[PDB]
């Protein structure tokens, strides 16, 4: 058939907002930046022009890094974090992208070809149990119980989701923990030929223009992170996600009610769930034990 | 049919990161770039105007190649490459992207066409087995066996892309030995009759506006292309690639476990098993070995 | 059926390739040029202004053709090459695009008519020969043998592509022959009403802002080229392109195997070569053979 | 069915270069133009300022049509050229378009219901013979022989084509006739109260920044359509665009190898030949004559 | 079916050209207009600045309508129509494309059903009369005869056309007859405080840069509405736009040859004969026709 | 089937031209206003400078709301429509597009379900007839006569359609009758620190740049709606809307030719008309009651 889910619900969803809400906020932000048309700005005296100025003001933006220059006792780290937290930002995005985009084109094909095998013997069982009046599933369960091919691949990726969530809430803390009044710093022009001649001030007070900006974005990028992490934390373990409803409803049998573990069987249970509409039969299942009792 | 995977997984994914991320990264970085409005800028003297500090600045970074000029013993390499950077870093991703295209659309045909061919015969032999009761794949693959069409290509690819590979990590890291303290340098205008008039300073201190930028994007490269080489090596080994549980399952028979070395059969039981799931008979026989064990 | 390839494999990767590089590269060349905002700027004294300082600079700008002035004794071949260069080469791109077109809308109906005869004809041969047991495509290729009305067209292509080529590589030769030191030029006002005052300096030292940029470009497209013309030029032998293992395995009979020269019977053996995963004939062939072998 | 060919090959491809290299070339021109924002500047004297000045330049480009001023005999057609060659050119593409846009929408459902008629007649007939064993299309094309409605307007358009194409080669002719050193001009302000002031300069030498430009665009322009002229008179030719090769192979009969002059048979003939591929009697006939000789 | 055709060829196009030809050169006028940046300019003494300078442009652009203003005795109607030439010209665009619009999504199912009706009925007594061997549609275009439905509509279409092609055919000759010399005007500010106050001369003389391009534009688009009119003017003609050659070939029987006059038959013989090629009958009795003469 | 149509003629249209009509003229409003770059001017003396002019006029912009100031006994009511007119223009096609969105996504399928279930008991009841030679629809529309669900959801959009139309009326009317005279006005920094110093001028006179651009879309939408609003008021009444001719051809019988007044009835019999030629029988009946008369 056509219509099929290939992946999860809250696994989807928490990717898809994790790589949404990032990647929006820093377009609207370049959007309302380049409004202004720059982000830095440096003070210079009345005594130069229009060139000059612009030179020094690029001139201290370009050399935000040297080692041996802007003496404010600081360390030059949050300079270097207010230059390149956009380039980290989207970074974060696309690396949080990525993940999903490798489960849904390496292992999608044999999820979905398990569970239409699944719903067709399904059906053809139902099928065979309505004319008969007028194991298969069983032993194919117990044999995916002894493989971990796909439960491993499953594991490292959720892994990797909250070891990289947990990379960028500390690091968005630490972007956070820094102090306002840390962005005005002294800057000059003291190499080549410039050394020797004295016809220019020697401290020029400069100023990046991000700071409300881009601390609004990562104490919110800090919360809704913060937030997300435990939905991942939850969705992290299998054996408490299934549901005891799925094959306790088949005896028209099967016995693998107490199979639990880190197991195929599980991924397959939950799997199954998840995309269980397509099935006739189930619910007509629920209206004969329903019959029943 | 229609669902069908022309290529590998690792491969594709190590192929599509190589070209999407340095794409993304200087996409970034040319449109932050843009903000500034320029990335050169060298100082005038306050008794010029805005058009003749334009037109040394324009001149500055045009002439950034003539050899007589630009005493900083340094060799002018350095202001090549920041020069170069984003044209070497397009060109790498392009021919990154090249080989895949060029396996896409030269020799896809040929391998969906064989396995095609073995699934349906597959299938074909498993019903004539089922239907009995109620060697064409061997020798097919001992005629493939003295064959190497398909790995020479295989192989020159791979290589290709490896030896590409390390050349960008090793260019990306003679670009990233360079000092931070080597972009100021001097220029001056020394041609046509501006060679003997005096009315202007000989030394002009000019400075480029990309070092903290191409910094870091040299040494994100480096490390991303670091990491991702040994995944390429792995992938390049095809003997230890295959696993053994393809063929191990069709005693209903066929002698080619012990089959090694560098050959198309090897190729043809990897395409098999990561293009498994749309045959219906590989899982009956798993469930049968089971019975039988 | 629906799946077919018009068209071969080397000759659309070479015509790709060469349509394609070109194009990325002054695309990108273009780009990174409207950052400065111009590629023209001309030194003016300060004692203008910024209206005939602009006046001035578009006025050497244009004319810089006119023969009785840009006194520099080089004939202003290299000044009309770097004025022309990205009109001569989106040229070049759409007139190496152009030969594909003209092919693949003028002759290719006639080929996917013949291969498809071709492959039902020998589908339904094999049919009859198999329910035998429980020399129409001789005569046609005999017939074809006499006819020239393909490969006349396909050589007329590829020499016109060959020369165009050529005349590529030659061109971007000479313009990287230029010296480096061979942009600087004066300029002047001298016409009009212009001829007799003298309150302007006679002599304007100008400069083009497009050296190192269309220097990098001319010699990386003189490389492409020149890697790319041998495999034009092996691609253009049609007698030793066509492999001797397409007719050789149809004894079930056509004797065509000394078939040899410039004829429509190479062209079609390599297109059903190219195009022949289709068929589900040959492979059974190549099995049988075996068998016998 | 589906696929089918509406129109010819060679005409197709001739009205597609023609509407497409001159929108292409405007296109390249205007982008590469608006990088430097202007194509008009005049001089203008250090006692004014940047306003004034944009004025007298405005002014001077409007006032390029008024007879009574830009005294420089030479009747200002080659200003009003400069002015409107891209209006011109882009016309000159849009009415080259329309011709094929017309015959689209026109006739084109009678061809195609004809060549199906004539094709599944053929495919009817051919079963009809070959079944037998174990004059309709000729009374057809005698009736369509008296008749005049399709050449009429094919012949129609062809004109049409031609005689715009030349009419586009004899303007792109005179417009390059333009000498080089016929640009530059003189302008004033003489007009309103501005006629007895006398605190500004009386001439003005102004200039247009398009000589390099569209010189080369017309130049380039002339080229392609010189070569491409006898490409459209070759095709206007019916008679000897047919061949003979058509209708001679139907001997199974049919009476028409001798008609020739102006009538839908020869444009019948040459659609059906080009859309020939899509019948599979044609073929057969083929064989079965080279069995026959 | 699917394949048909809801309108008519000669009107299709005529209203397509109307639409379009306006649009592409008001586009075209727009993009080339803001090249420059702008379309008013007026002098300013070099006593004021910038500011003040771009203030009396922009008042005396606004105040272009005001009735006490502007001395030039020439009653403002021709600013008024410089202001307003592409706010007509895109509603005379909008108001042409609108009709079409009404009669494709008001009366297009009515005609549809009603061939359809008509060419099934037609093959099926095709089909009685071929199968006997071996006046429905009399009564129903009789029927139609009393009606006026949609031939009402039809008119009232053309009428709406004819009427607005006639004024904008007028309104261009008058806008065209605008003399050259009739855009140079004075302006002024004497309105608040600014009427005691001297510091400011009391004329300005202010341009509008419109002159040579909307004249072109005028004078093409009269051009071209009065060589479209007569086609409007032909195309109302429903009489005689009805040929005789469609009823004529039913006789296997009809009487209605002599059906004349404002009526729903003509339209729809004039339909039918448009969209005639969807039946497989209307040949075959041209070609019986013949035999029989 | 496929082919419906879920709204009427009239409505939709008149809608379309409501919605579409403003966002034309709007967005040409727009796209012309930014070519000047800005709509607010405001003279500043020539001892300042471009930066505290520019200051001058963004506070006069921004402070034009402010009660205790802009002295120009107006009330401040003419300069707030001047501000907001393109947000009310927006605001008025996004709530007159909004009821035909809510009309399409609420109530649709229940009428092209109950229209579908007319056609085939249609079909059904004609078939019927027709094979017996050789009140299902009379008791359905009489329940619907007694239901109103569809007609007070219709007669409710209708009416805030009228009555939004007639604020839009009222509006644009109150807005035209703005004197031209009205725009010019005083501004003055009266405020923090600037109220007791003296270097600046009391008295500015701004401007905004709007009027006979806004002047002409105010009166043109209001012609436009006021020729809009009888056709709503004309489609309002849907007892005259309904025509006679529907159920008086069904006489094979149905008895409710004297229904009226506001029921579902009427709105049943207005959409069936309009959607009648997807059914086969209608015209069968026209025909069958012509020879019947």
Same mark, same amino acid.
């Given at each position: 058939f056509k219509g099929l889910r290939l992946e999860l619900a809250v696994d989807k969803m928490v990717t898809c907002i994790a790589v949404g809400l990032p990647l929006l906020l820093i377009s609207l932000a370049f959007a309302q930046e380049i409004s202004i048309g720059t982000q830095i700005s440096c003070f210079s005296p009345s005594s130069f022009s229009w060139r000059q100025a612009a030179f020094v003001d690029s001139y201290c933006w370009a050399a935000v890094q040297q080692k041996n220059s802007l003496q404010s006792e600081s360390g030059n780290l949050p300079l270097w974090?207010?230059?390149?937290?956009?380039?980290?930002?989207?970074?974060?995005? /696309? $690396?949080?992208?990525?993940?999903?985009? +490798?489960?849904?084109?390496?292992?999608?094909?044999?999820? =979905?070809?398990?569970?239409?095998?699944?719903?067709?013997?399904?059906?053809?069982?139902?099928?065979?149990? /309505?004319?008969?009046?007028?194991?298969?599933?069983?032993?194919?369960?117990?044999?995916?119980?002894?493989?971990?091919? $796909?439960?491993?691949?499953?594991?490292? =990726?959720?892994? $990797?989701?909250?070891?990289?969530?947990?990379?960028a809430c500390i690091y968005l803390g630490y972007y956070f923990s820094l102090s306002s009044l840390s962005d005005e710093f002294v800057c000059s022009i003291k190499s080549g030929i410039l050394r020797n001649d004295?016809?220019?001030?020697?401290?020029?007070? =400069?100023?990046?223009?991000?700071?409300?900006?881009?601390?609004?974005?990562?104490?919110?990028?800090?919360?809704?992170?913060?937030?997300?992490?435990?939905?991942?934390?939850?969705? $992290?373990?299998?054996? +408490?996600?299934?549901?005891?409803?799925?094959?306790?409803?088949?005896? /028209?049998?099967?016995?693998?009610?107490?199979?639990?573990?880190?197991?195929?069987?599980?991924?397959?249970?939950?799997?199954?769930?998840?995309? /269980?509409?397509e099935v006739k039969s189930y619910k007509c299942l629920k209206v004969l034990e329903n019959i029943k009792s």
């Open positions: 974090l207010h230059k390149f937290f956009p380039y980290i930002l989207l970074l974060f995005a /696309i $690396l949080l992208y990525l993940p999903p985009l +490798f489960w849904r084109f390496a292992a999608a094909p044999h999820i =979905c070809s398990d569970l239409k095998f699944i719903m067709e013997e399904l059906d053809k069982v139902y099928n065979r149990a /309505i004319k008969a009046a007028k194991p298969i599933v069983e032993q194919y369960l117990k044999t995916k119980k002894n493989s971990n091919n $796909l439960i491993i691949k499953y594991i490292s =990726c959720r892994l $990797l989701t909250l070891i990289i969530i947990l990379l004295s016809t220019v001030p020697d401290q020029f007070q =400069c100023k990046l223009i991000a700071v409300g900006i881009f601390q609004l974005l990562s104490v919110i990028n800090l919360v809704v992170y913060v937030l997300l992490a435990p939905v991942v934390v939850y969705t $992290l373990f299998v054996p +408490f996600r299934q549901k005891t409803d799925v094959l306790k409803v088949y005896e /028209i049998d099967v016995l693998h009610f107490k199979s639990e573990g880190y197991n195929d069987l599980s991924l397959y249970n939950l799997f199954l769930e998840e995309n /269980i509409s």
